[PDB]
Design a protein around this ligand. Structure first.
Ligand SMILES: [Mg+2]
Ligand SMILES: [Mg+2]
Ligand SMILES: [Mg+2]
Ligand SMILES: [Mg+2]
Ligand SMILES: [Mg+2]
Ligand SMILES: [Mg+2]
Ligand SMILES: [Mg+2]
Ligand SMILES: [Mg+2]
Ligand SMILES: [Mg+2]
Ligand SMILES: [Mg+2]
Ligand SMILES: [Mg+2]
Ligand SMILES: [Mg+2]
Ligand SMILES: [Mg+2]
Ligand SMILES: [Mg+2]
Ligand SMILES: [Mg+2]
Ligand SMILES: [Mg+2]
Ligand SMILES: [Mg+2]
Ligand SMILES: [Mg+2]
Ligand SMILES: [Mg+2]
Ligand SMILES: [Mg+2]
Ligand SMILES: [Mg+2]
Ligand SMILES: [Mg+2]
Ligand SMILES: [Mg+2]
Ligand SMILES: [Mg+2]
Ligand SMILES: [Mg+2]
Ligand SMILES: [Mg+2]
Ligand SMILES: [Mg+2]
Ligand SMILES: [Mg+2]
Ligand SMILES: [Mg+2]
Ligand SMILES: [Mg+2]
Ligand SMILES: [Mg+2]
Ligand SMILES: [Mg+2]
Ligand SMILES: [Mg+2]
Ligand SMILES: [Mg+2]
Ligand SMILES: [Mg+2]
Ligand SMILES: [Mg+2]
Ligand SMILES: [Mg+2]
Ligand SMILES: [Mg+2]
Ligand SMILES: [Mg+2]
Ligand SMILES: [Mg+2]
Ligand SMILES: [Mg+2]
Ligand SMILES: [Mg+2]
Ligand SMILES: [Mg+2]
Ligand SMILES: [Mg+2]
Ligand SMILES: [Mg+2]
Ligand SMILES: [Mg+2]
Ligand SMILES: [Mg+2]
Ligand SMILES: [Mg+2]
Ligand SMILES: [Mg+2]
Ligand SMILES: [Mg+2]
Ligand SMILES: [Mg+2]
Ligand SMILES: [Mg+2]
Ligand SMILES: [Mg+2]
Ligand SMILES: [Mg+2]
Ligand SMILES: [Mg+2]
Ligand SMILES: [Mg+2]
Ligand SMILES: [Mg+2]
Ligand SMILES: [Mg+2]
Ligand SMILES: [Mg+2]
Ligand SMILES: [Mg+2]
Ligand SMILES: [Mg+2]
Ligand SMILES: [Mg+2]
Ligand SMILES: [Mg+2]
Ligand SMILES: [Mg+2]
Ligand SMILES: [Mg+2]
Ligand SMILES: [Mg+2]
Ligand SMILES: [Mg+2]
Ligand SMILES: [Mg+2]
Ligand SMILES: [Mg+2]
Ligand SMILES: [Mg+2]
Ligand SMILES: [Mg+2]
Ligand SMILES: [Mg+2]
Ligand SMILES: [Mg+2]
Ligand SMILES: [Mg+2]
Ligand SMILES: [Mg+2]
Ligand SMILES: [Mg+2]
Ligand SMILES: [Mg+2]
Ligand SMILES: [Mg+2]
Ligand SMILES: [Mg+2]
Ligand SMILES: [Mg+2]
Ligand SMILES: [Mg+2]
Ligand SMILES: [Mg+2]
Ligand SMILES: [Mg+2]
Ligand SMILES: [Mg+2]
Ligand SMILES: [Mg+2]
Ligand SMILES: [Mg+2]
Ligand SMILES: [Mg+2]
Ligand SMILES: [Mg+2]
Ligand SMILES: [Mg+2]
Ligand SMILES: [Mg+2]
Ligand SMILES: [Mg+2]
Ligand SMILES: [Mg+2]
Ligand SMILES: [Mg+2]
Ligand SMILES: [Mg+2]
Ligand SMILES: [Mg+2]
Ligand SMILES: [Mg+2]
Ligand SMILES: [Mg+2]
Ligand SMILES: [Mg+2]
Ligand SMILES: [Mg+2]
Ligand SMILES: [Mg+2]
Ligand SMILES: [Mg+2]
Ligand SMILES: [Mg+2]
Ligand SMILES: [Mg+2]
Ligand SMILES: [Mg+2]
Ligand SMILES: [Mg+2]
Ligand SMILES: [Mg+2]
Ligand SMILES: [Mg+2]
Ligand SMILES: [Mg+2]
Ligand SMILES: [Mg+2]
Ligand SMILES: [Mg+2]
Ligand SMILES: [Mg+2]
Ligand SMILES: [Mg+2]
Ligand SMILES: [Mg+2]
Ligand SMILES: [Mg+2]
Ligand SMILES: [Mg+2]
Ligand SMILES: [Mg+2]
Ligand SMILES: [Mg+2]
Ligand SMILES: [Mg+2]
Ligand SMILES: [Mg+2]
Ligand SMILES: [Mg+2]
Ligand SMILES: [Mg+2]
Ligand SMILES: [Mg+2]
Ligand SMILES: [Mg+2]
Ligand SMILES: [Mg+2]
Ligand SMILES: [Mg+2]
Ligand SMILES: [Mg+2]
Ligand SMILES: [Mg+2]
Ligand SMILES: [Mg+2]
Ligand SMILES: [Mg+2]
Ligand SMILES: [Mg+2]
Ligand SMILES: [Mg+2]
Ligand SMILES: [Mg+2]
Ligand SMILES: [Mg+2]
Ligand SMILES: [Mg+2]
Ligand SMILES: [Mg+2]
Ligand SMILES: [Mg+2]
Ligand SMILES: [Mg+2]
Ligand SMILES: [Mg+2]
Ligand SMILES: [Mg+2]
Ligand SMILES: [Mg+2]
Ligand SMILES: [Mg+2]
Ligand SMILES: [Mg+2]
Ligand SMILES: [Mg+2]
Ligand SMILES: [Mg+2]
Ligand SMILES: [Mg+2]
Ligand SMILES: [Mg+2]
Ligand SMILES: [Mg+2]
Ligand SMILES: [Mg+2]
Ligand SMILES: [Mg+2]
Ligand SMILES: [Mg+2]
Ligand SMILES: [Mg+2]
Ligand SMILES: [Mg+2]
Ligand SMILES: [Mg+2]
Ligand SMILES: [Mg+2]
Ligand SMILES: [Mg+2]
Ligand SMILES: [Mg+2]
Ligand SMILES: [Mg+2]
Ligand SMILES: [Mg+2]
Ligand SMILES: [Mg+2]
Ligand SMILES: [Mg+2]
Ligand SMILES: [Mg+2]
Ligand SMILES: [Mg+2]
Ligand SMILES: [Mg+2]
Ligand SMILES: [Mg+2]
Ligand SMILES: [Mg+2]
Ligand SMILES: [Mg+2]
Ligand SMILES: [Mg+2]
Ligand SMILES: [Mg+2]
Ligand SMILES: [Mg+2]
Ligand SMILES: [Mg+2]
Ligand SMILES: [Mg+2]
Ligand SMILES: [Mg+2]
Ligand SMILES: [Mg+2]
Ligand SMILES: [Mg+2]
Ligand SMILES: [Mg+2]
Ligand SMILES: [Mg+2]
Ligand SMILES: [Mg+2]
Ligand SMILES: [Mg+2]
Ligand SMILES: [Mg+2]
Ligand SMILES: [Mg+2]
Ligand SMILES: [Mg+2]
Ligand SMILES: [Mg+2]
Ligand SMILES: [Mg+2]
Ligand SMILES: [Mg+2]
Ligand SMILES: [Mg+2]
Ligand SMILES: [Mg+2]
Ligand SMILES: [Mg+2]
Ligand SMILES: [Mg+2]
Ligand SMILES: [Mg+2]
Ligand SMILES: [Mg+2]
Ligand SMILES: [Mg+2]
Ligand SMILES: [Mg+2]
Ligand SMILES: [Mg+2]
Ligand SMILES: [Mg+2]
Ligand SMILES: [Mg+2]
Ligand SMILES: [Mg+2]
Ligand SMILES: [Mg+2]
Ligand SMILES: [Mg+2]
Ligand SMILES: [Mg+2]
Ligand SMILES: [Mg+2]
Ligand SMILES: [Mg+2]
Ligand SMILES: [Mg+2]
Ligand SMILES: [Mg+2]
Ligand SMILES: [Mg+2]
Ligand SMILES: [Mg+2]
Ligand SMILES: [Mg+2]
Ligand SMILES: [Mg+2]
Ligand SMILES: [Mg+2]
Ligand SMILES: [Mg+2]
Ligand SMILES: [Mg+2]
Ligand SMILES: [Mg+2]
Ligand SMILES: [Mg+2]
Ligand SMILES: [Mg+2]
Ligand SMILES: [Mg+2]
Ligand SMILES: [Mg+2]
Ligand SMILES: [Mg+2]
Ligand SMILES: [Mg+2]
Ligand SMILES: [Mg+2]
Ligand SMILES: [Mg+2]
Ligand SMILES: [Mg+2]
Ligand SMILES: [Mg+2]
Ligand SMILES: [Mg+2]
Ligand SMILES: [Mg+2]
Ligand SMILES: [Mg+2]
Ligand SMILES: [Mg+2]
Ligand SMILES: [Mg+2]
Ligand SMILES: [Mg+2]
Ligand SMILES: [Mg+2]
Ligand SMILES: [Mg+2]
Ligand SMILES: [Mg+2]
Ligand SMILES: [Mg+2]
Ligand SMILES: [Mg+2]
Ligand SMILES: [Mg+2]
Ligand SMILES: [Mg+2]
Ligand SMILES: [Mg+2]
Ligand SMILES: [Mg+2]
Ligand SMILES: [Mg+2]
Ligand SMILES: [Mg+2]
Ligand SMILES: [Mg+2]
Ligand SMILES: [Mg+2]
Ligand SMILES: [Mg+2]
Ligand SMILES: [Mg+2]
Ligand SMILES: [Mg+2]
Ligand SMILES: [Mg+2]
Ligand SMILES: [Mg+2]
Ligand SMILES: [Mg+2]
Ligand SMILES: [Mg+2]
Ligand SMILES: [Mg+2]
Lengths: 117, 150
RNA sequence: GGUCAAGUGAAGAAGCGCAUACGGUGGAUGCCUUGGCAGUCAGAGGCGAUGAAAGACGUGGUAGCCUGCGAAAAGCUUCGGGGAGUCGGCAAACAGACUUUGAUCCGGAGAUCUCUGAAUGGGGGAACCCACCUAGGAUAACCUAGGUAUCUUGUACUGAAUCCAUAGGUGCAAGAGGCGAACCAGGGGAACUGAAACAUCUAAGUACCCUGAGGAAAAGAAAUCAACCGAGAUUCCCUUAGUAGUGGCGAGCGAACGGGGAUUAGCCCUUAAGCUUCAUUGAUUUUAGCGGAACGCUCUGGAAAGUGCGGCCAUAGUGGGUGAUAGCCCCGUACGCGAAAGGAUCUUUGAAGUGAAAUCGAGUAGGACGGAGCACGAGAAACUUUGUCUGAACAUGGGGGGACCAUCCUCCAAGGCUAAAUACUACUGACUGACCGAUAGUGAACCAGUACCGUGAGGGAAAGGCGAAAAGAACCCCGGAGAGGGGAGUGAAAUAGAACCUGAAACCGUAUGCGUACAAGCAGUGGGAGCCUACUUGUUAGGUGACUGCGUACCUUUUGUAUAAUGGGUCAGCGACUUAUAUUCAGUGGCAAGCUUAACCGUAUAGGGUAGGCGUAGCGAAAGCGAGUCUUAAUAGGGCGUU
RNA sequence: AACCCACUCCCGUUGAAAAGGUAGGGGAUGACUUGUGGAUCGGAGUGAAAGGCUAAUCAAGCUCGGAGAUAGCUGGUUCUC
RNA sequence: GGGGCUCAAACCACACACCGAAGCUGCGGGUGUCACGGUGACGCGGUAGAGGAGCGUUCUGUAAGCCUGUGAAGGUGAGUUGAGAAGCUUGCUGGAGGUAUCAGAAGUGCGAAUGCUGACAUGAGUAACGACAAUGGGUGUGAAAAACACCCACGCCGAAAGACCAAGGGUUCCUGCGCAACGUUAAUCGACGCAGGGUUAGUCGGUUCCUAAGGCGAGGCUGAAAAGCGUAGUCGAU
RNA sequence: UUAAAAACACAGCACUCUGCAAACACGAAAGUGGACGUAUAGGGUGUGACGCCUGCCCGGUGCCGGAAGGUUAAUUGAUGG
RNA sequence: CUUGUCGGGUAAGUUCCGACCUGCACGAAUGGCGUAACGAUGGCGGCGCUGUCUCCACCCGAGACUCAGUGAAAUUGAAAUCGCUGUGAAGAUGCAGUGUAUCCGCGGCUAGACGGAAAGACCCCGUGAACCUUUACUGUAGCUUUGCACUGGACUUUGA
RNA sequence: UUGACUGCGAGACAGACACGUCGAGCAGGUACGAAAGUAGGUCUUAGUGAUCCGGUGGUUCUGUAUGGAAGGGCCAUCGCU
């Protein structure tokens, strides 16, 4: 029983070369270079699911700082004031109100201020 | 493999990978690494393990109603159509016929019949008893299984 | 609306990137096969001086090569078969013919059979040169047919030193010589390697070289083993047993007795079985052939063997191929018949020969020295054999029973012949394969031991596929009376067009969409505007990716590599833990104080065969004793073992 | 001078050439040079001796066998959880 | 680390707030072990290495089955399903084969070995085009002329770069017809392709006659065998 | 085929061996060379035209001569156990 | 030691020539000391001559350069392939910080890519290999001693 | 005066193995001491070398047809800078 490798080997190389679509030069058309490019792309994607959550908290916090100082308060003093009174609203929701619903953000900043913080 | 007695090139200095023979298994026309030789595939089965499987098969054939017992089964003159009519009375098409001794006439018929085999008590193996849809046995052959199989 | 100023900044790509669509190159993959590989069952096991194996040259209606033949040259004569086409293939055309008054074709027996080659009349650089003798025929400068090597054996004649007769010399007959894959019996005989170095030892009496024989060979009928009971020639298989031994007692080597089988057989020197060669008596096979059953309609289709419906044959039903898948279309198959003439085998009965050595074994048995062989390496070392040197007895005698002696037992050496069971396959036929399928399988599917390489010995490739059928593209146009194309035709299909099935990847292009000329690095990824396309007209799908956060390839080797340490230009194909025999442990089964057979028979995967192996008892170095035993003066102690 | 040789420079070094070329150099009646044919070879030959030469190969030629020598050493070793 | 920093954005004390990991919590999934009868509990980084469970390829049985010209294998896109190796369904191409399920058997899975064979890239349209005797016009032919033929001039060799024997080669010789490949460019030309033709001996050279070095060598002598040496003899030119 | 030399050879010199079937060399051997030679010859070794010369040591290791004594092989086999 | 010391030659002489003797470590056929002629032999010094040089300039041919035709090679993981100062398998185009900088050719030069080429030849290791030496070990061809055989007769000396 | 004894040995310490170290108690025979008792060398820790092979003294073993013997086993002991 002699087994020939032609059909199975070709099917396996085409799966890798389809994931390497859009890469530059030999990274999208030769198997040896495209195999390493696909592995490193998956290494980056695993790490950047952690970094996506970090990059978005930093963006919300920076926008909350800009909106609070327009009402006479810094970010660190507003967070302490919110925790003092009641509020559990996310940084994600807070950054949305700072840009879109500016009259609601002012009310929250004014209530956090009234907690003497 | 023929040829390949000498080194293709000297060991050092040519800038090529080391070679000792052109008939290497890594080369195009070279030999097979673990080439085969004619060997035997034949296991040992205990005499009693063989009989225990026959008892197990025959017991299951009765439970599944795939065994038909008749009082003697003989035909006169070798004619395939003579046997086909006889088997049609019992309503069997794919059948194994077991008798205490294979008659010449019954062997000459059923030789060209497609899904019919005529065997003997000592000639019927575990595979044939499972392969066919029905087994036809005579009372004289049933007595013969009891002596052989206890 | 005008001028001025400040701000802002679309489009415009020499060329590149990604995506998609079409091509090109290239030849993978799939499917296929006139070629290989390994077996089983048979055959017959040699050819050659009556000229072999192997060749050169020639031979055809027309050039070459392959096949066949040999100046009578793809053939001549006879028998036997058949039953209409034929003049071999690559490889086609044009011609000339052959014939039911029997061709081509197949088988048996004949005839012819150049030159070289053991090559054989003498030479020689193989395929060439030069001769002599006899018989017959021509008259010119020869023709035809036979002879002429060497050695051995036998025979006839002849005859040196030398009288005799010896060596020698001529003539007749008979034989040999050379080739061949293996098997067999002999002569000569390594090393690498292992011993984790290496001398003894091993590898191994292997590889290799040489010489003889045969279809087999060799060996074979006890001066053999056993053990006080017996067996009964030789050969081969399975066990005894990796035991007793042997061994720098290292690495290693390794029996026999006794059992189970295959085969069956002995006969002579007061002259036999047997074997050869003739002549006869019958039978059987081989070399060629002959007969050999049973199907129609319908649908799709270029074409049915496929769909649907109904039948028939069977000692013939998973054969091959026919326009796609056929028991009933063809060739076949089961089953029946067959041979003018050769071959072979077995069978009667007649002859000739051989066996054959004459008369029971003397330079023999035994011994001393040096070696070889026995599983046994000098060892307590028996036995066989012999290079050197010696050397008996005569059946009230001689050999052996592992130093040697005694007693018993058992054989009769120095003379022969003998089948079967056993080994091997270069070669021929049939059948088979959980073998390969064109980088595989033979090096070799194809004009391969070729092309090519080397002075030579020698080494040694690449290279398969149109289509069912050549129906292989008449004719027109561009072009050099080209190459190559555009039409037209053939075809089911020419993007099946001869470099012809399918036609992947690397690699190279054309077209369209988006991006790219102030911007620094493993080229990706998290986020993300804009533009283009499609339709569900935007919580959608596809293509691009301005800008921005992070981010120094893979393998190996290492304490540690982005490492400026190793490896890789890329693609496609191939490429590395197997098999046999002995074992131990685990899982899963069958039997169970028992379990299981090996060779071998076989009604052949059944059944038989229980010789043997393991278990049911241990202790001791052993004799031995035994649920005990060893140590010891010791039923004390202790070691090992026992429910 | 021819002929045999090979002292120097340069060029060439992927060469016109796997040892050459141009310009100079030595011997040139002799222990000379050369054609044809022949003899000696692998632990062997030959050597006015360099371990030189024996078919571009020499501190032991080439070829085929033992033979898949051996390699405590480098390299490589192929799907998934 | 840079910009920049002086009642600091330095240093010494004290205080309160915030940011900040794949740590912890929240929400949704998957798995290992143990206990109970699907729940509870705590685990789930990993090289050498040990243990467990699987995917896919070829062949054999199941299979005289089932699928298939209303289109098999293969190739090329799209969609979809699993934790993965992978599976499934379809458009186009292709034109005749494939193998469900569960078992059995392996030439069973490549990116590396300065791996082997074939094809194709980069260098790059870059180096080079082989003695630095040397060429310029006219005419003809032809699809096309720097190179072919002829003519008029110019250069080079001439103890050769001219003639002739031998060795070696083997048709390269001459003539018609050609230009794909060969010729380091083109070619109408050629030592290239096709087809014809061409070599005439008593005196030339061999053969025949003779021998040298040397070879072979009837008998012979020697040697485990193969064989060595050699006499008569007979080969061997230079 | 990176070394042409001071390296090798050389004429001359000396030592030593060899009486001819020579010493010596190639050959399991037959035989062949030396040599169809014969000590003014042949082999080996060193030195190296020519001139003047070549000194001391015989303890070591070689070679040559001696044969009294000591040691000493195969072989033989008294004696003892 | 050492470029010993003295003399000569030069403006200046580790080389050269002539001496001295303290010969690390000359020496008499592995010859000692001389020697005319000879040498593509080693060292030193003069005359002539000069692009050897100060210090290069111009000119002539063959390449290089451009156009037409034909058309290689080693190399190569993939490249969107800058400087500096640090860091770091310890000497960075690729990492950190920072500075510069529109995109692409052609003619030149070689500072780097630890540039290409050849599994370092130096060095060490392997219970590796060859070949060479000898008073290493164990053997052996050859040469030589003696016993027996081929191999006999007689006489004499002499031991038992 | 010979306890520098003979057969053992509960139990330990050390320790990859092969080796090593300590030892109450029992049985035989002893020596000292009136006796309880002490004694299996020396105040302790170095003074050493495996297996193979060969030799010597014993021996309820074996002993290749049988009775012996040779040879082997067991116990004691000898031969390694
Ligand atoms: Mg394969
Ligand atoms: Mg992209
Ligand atoms: Mg963050
Ligand atoms: Mg965060
Ligand atoms: Mg062959
Ligand atoms: Mg070879
Ligand atoms: Mg190689
Ligand atoms: Mg090889
Ligand atoms: Mg090899
Ligand atoms: Mg091949
Ligand atoms: Mg092969
Ligand atoms: Mg192969
Ligand atoms: Mg059985
Ligand atoms: Mg049947
Ligand atoms: Mg472009
Ligand atoms: Mg593009
Ligand atoms: Mg593109
Ligand atoms: Mg036969
Ligand atoms: Mg014959
Ligand atoms: Mg011919
Ligand atoms: Mg011919
Ligand atoms: Mg012919
Ligand atoms: Mg022929
Ligand atoms: Mg004739
Ligand atoms: Mg006829
Ligand atoms: Mg002849
Ligand atoms: Mg002849
Ligand atoms: Mg004759
Ligand atoms: Mg002749
Ligand atoms: Mg005579
Ligand atoms: Mg013969
Ligand atoms: Mg043969
Ligand atoms: Mg022999
Ligand atoms: Mg033999
Ligand atoms: Mg022998
Ligand atoms: Mg050896
Ligand atoms: Mg060894
Ligand atoms: Mg070893
Ligand atoms: Mg060694
Ligand atoms: Mg040894
Ligand atoms: Mg030795
Ligand atoms: Mg041996
Ligand atoms: Mg032999
Ligand atoms: Mg024969
Ligand atoms: Mg015979
Ligand atoms: Mg024969
Ligand atoms: Mg015969
Ligand atoms: Mg036979
Ligand atoms: Mg015989
Ligand atoms: Mg015989
Ligand atoms: Mg008796
Ligand atoms: Mg008998
Ligand atoms: Mg040993
Ligand atoms: Mg036996
Ligand atoms: Mg027996
Ligand atoms: Mg026939
Ligand atoms: Mg017929
Ligand atoms: Mg028929
Ligand atoms: Mg028939
Ligand atoms: Mg068929
Ligand atoms: Mg078809
Ligand atoms: Mg059919
Ligand atoms: Mg029909
Ligand atoms: Mg007798
Ligand atoms: Mg004797
Ligand atoms: Mg002897
Ligand atoms: Mg012996
Ligand atoms: Mg021994
Ligand atoms: Mg005896
Ligand atoms: Mg004798
Ligand atoms: Mg005897
Ligand atoms: Mg007797
Ligand atoms: Mg005895
Ligand atoms: Mg015996
Ligand atoms: Mg006899
Ligand atoms: Mg045999
Ligand atoms: Mg046979
Ligand atoms: Mg193919
Ligand atoms: Mg092939
Ligand atoms: Mg091949
Ligand atoms: Mg050649
Ligand atoms: Mg040739
Ligand atoms: Mg048509
Ligand atoms: Mg197509
Ligand atoms: Mg087609
Ligand atoms: Mg087809
Ligand atoms: Mg095609
Ligand atoms: Mg492609
Ligand atoms: Mg482009
Ligand atoms: Mg821009
Ligand atoms: Mg700027
Ligand atoms: Mg850049
Ligand atoms: Mg995104
Ligand atoms: Mg989008
Ligand atoms: Mg992005
Ligand atoms: Mg980015
Ligand atoms: Mg980075
Ligand atoms: Mg970064
Ligand atoms: Mg690597
Ligand atoms: Mg390292
Ligand atoms: Mg290191
Ligand atoms: Mg370290
Ligand atoms: Mg790092
Ligand atoms: Mg790297
Ligand atoms: Mg780098
Ligand atoms: Mg390196
Ligand atoms: Mg690197
Ligand atoms: Mg390294
Ligand atoms: Mg590399
Ligand atoms: Mg292969
Ligand atoms: Mg078990
Ligand atoms: Mg069990
Ligand atoms: Mg006890
Ligand atoms: Mg116990
Ligand atoms: Mg010379
Ligand atoms: Mg010059
Ligand atoms: Mg010259
Ligand atoms: Mg001359
Ligand atoms: Mg002269
Ligand atoms: Mg002269
Ligand atoms: Mg001269
Ligand atoms: Mg001459
Ligand atoms: Mg010659
Ligand atoms: Mg020769
Ligand atoms: Mg040699
Ligand atoms: Mg030599
Ligand atoms: Mg020499
Ligand atoms: Mg030599
Ligand atoms: Mg030397
Ligand atoms: Mg050669
Ligand atoms: Mg050479
Ligand atoms: Mg050698
Ligand atoms: Mg071997
Ligand atoms: Mg070999
Ligand atoms: Mg090898
Ligand atoms: Mg190695
Ligand atoms: Mg090591
Ligand atoms: Mg390495
Ligand atoms: Mg390697
Ligand atoms: Mg920073
Ligand atoms: Mg303050
Ligand atoms: Mg905090
Ligand atoms: Mg977090
Ligand atoms: Mg966690
Ligand atoms: Mg949860
Ligand atoms: Mg964890
Ligand atoms: Mg884990
Ligand atoms: Mg199947
Ligand atoms: Mg279709
Ligand atoms: Mg398939
Ligand atoms: Mg398809
Ligand atoms: Mg088919
Ligand atoms: Mg299947
Ligand atoms: Mg394979
Ligand atoms: Mg293979
Ligand atoms: Mg394999
Ligand atoms: Mg494989
Ligand atoms: Mg790999
Ligand atoms: Mg690959
Ligand atoms: Mg890998
Ligand atoms: Mg390379
Ligand atoms: Mg390799
Ligand atoms: Mg590779
Ligand atoms: Mg390759
Ligand atoms: Mg290019
Ligand atoms: Mg360039
Ligand atoms: Mg250039
Ligand atoms: Mg150029
Ligand atoms: Mg040139
Ligand atoms: Mg002109
Ligand atoms: Mg010209
Ligand atoms: Mg002249
Ligand atoms: Mg001329
Ligand atoms: Mg001329
Ligand atoms: Mg000629
Ligand atoms: Mg030629
Ligand atoms: Mg011609
Ligand atoms: Mg011509
Ligand atoms: Mg012409
Ligand atoms: Mg043209
Ligand atoms: Mg050409
Ligand atoms: Mg051309
Ligand atoms: Mg040229
Ligand atoms: Mg021509
Ligand atoms: Mg002669
Ligand atoms: Mg001769
Ligand atoms: Mg003769
Ligand atoms: Mg002659
Ligand atoms: Mg002549
Ligand atoms: Mg030289
Ligand atoms: Mg010279
Ligand atoms: Mg030179
Ligand atoms: Mg010299
Ligand atoms: Mg001589
Ligand atoms: Mg003399
Ligand atoms: Mg001499
Ligand atoms: Mg001298
Ligand atoms: Mg001299
Ligand atoms: Mg000299
Ligand atoms: Mg001198
Ligand atoms: Mg002396
Ligand atoms: Mg003296
Ligand atoms: Mg003397
Ligand atoms: Mg000095
Ligand atoms: Mg001085
Ligand atoms: Mg001075
Ligand atoms: Mg000077
Ligand atoms: Mg001077
Ligand atoms: Mg001086
Ligand atoms: Mg001094
Ligand atoms: Mg001196
Ligand atoms: Mg002297
Ligand atoms: Mg001296
Ligand atoms: Mg002097
Ligand atoms: Mg001279
Ligand atoms: Mg000279
Ligand atoms: Mg001079
Ligand atoms: Mg000067
Ligand atoms: Mg100038
Ligand atoms: Mg110029
Ligand atoms: Mg151009
Ligand atoms: Mg150009
Ligand atoms: Mg830097
Ligand atoms: Mg740095
Ligand atoms: Mg930098
Ligand atoms: Mg980077
Ligand atoms: Mg950086
Ligand atoms: Mg970083
Ligand atoms: Mg440039
Ligand atoms: Mg340059
Ligand atoms: Mg550079
Ligand atoms: Mg460098
Ligand atoms: Mg380098
Ligand atoms: Mg290597
Ligand atoms: Mg190395
Ligand atoms: Mg050592
Ligand atoms: Mg070692
Ligand atoms: Mg030596
Ligand atoms: Mg020695
Ligand atoms: Mg000797
Ligand atoms: Mg003698
Ligand atoms: Mg004492
Ligand atoms: Mg005590
Ligand atoms: Mg006591
Ligand atoms: Mg007392
Ligand atoms: Mg030893
Ligand atoms: Mg006895
Ligand atoms: Mg004894």
């Amino acid at each position: 029983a002699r087994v020939k490798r032609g059909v199975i080997a070709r099917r396996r190389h085409k799966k890798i070369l389809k994931l390497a679509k859009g890469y530059y030069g030999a990274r999208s058309r030769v198997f040896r270079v495209a195999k390493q490019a696909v592995i490193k792309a998956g290494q980056y994607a695993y790490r950047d699911r952690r970094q996506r959550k970090r990059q978005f908290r930093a963006l919300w916090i920076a926008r909350i700082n800009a909106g609070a100082r327009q009402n006479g308060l810094s970010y660190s003093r507003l967070i302490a004031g919110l925790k003092k009174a009641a509020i559990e609203i996310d940084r994600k929701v807070l950054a949305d109100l700072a840009v879109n619903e500016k009259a609601a953000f002012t009310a929250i900043v004014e209530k956090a201020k009234a907690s003497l913080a | 493999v023929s040829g390949g007695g000498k080194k293709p090139w000297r060991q050092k200095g040519t800038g090529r990978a080391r070679a000792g023979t052109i008939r290497s298994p890594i080369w195009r026309g070279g030999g097979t690494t673990f080439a085969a030789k004619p060997r035997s595939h034949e296991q040992k089965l205990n005499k009693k393990m063989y009989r225990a499987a026959l008892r197990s098969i025959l017991a299951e054939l009765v439970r599944l109603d795939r065994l038909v017992v008749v009082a003697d089964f003989a035909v006169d003159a070798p004619k395939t159509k003579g046997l086909v009519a006889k088997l049609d009375t019992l309503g069997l098409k794919d059948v194994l016929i077991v008798t205490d001794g294979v008659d010449e006439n019954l062997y000459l018929a059923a030789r060209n019949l497609a899904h019919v085999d005529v065997r003997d008590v000592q000639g019927s193996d575990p595979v044939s008893l499972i392969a066919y849809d029905k087994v036809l046995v005579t009372v004289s052959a049933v007595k013969k299984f009891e002596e052989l199989l206890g």
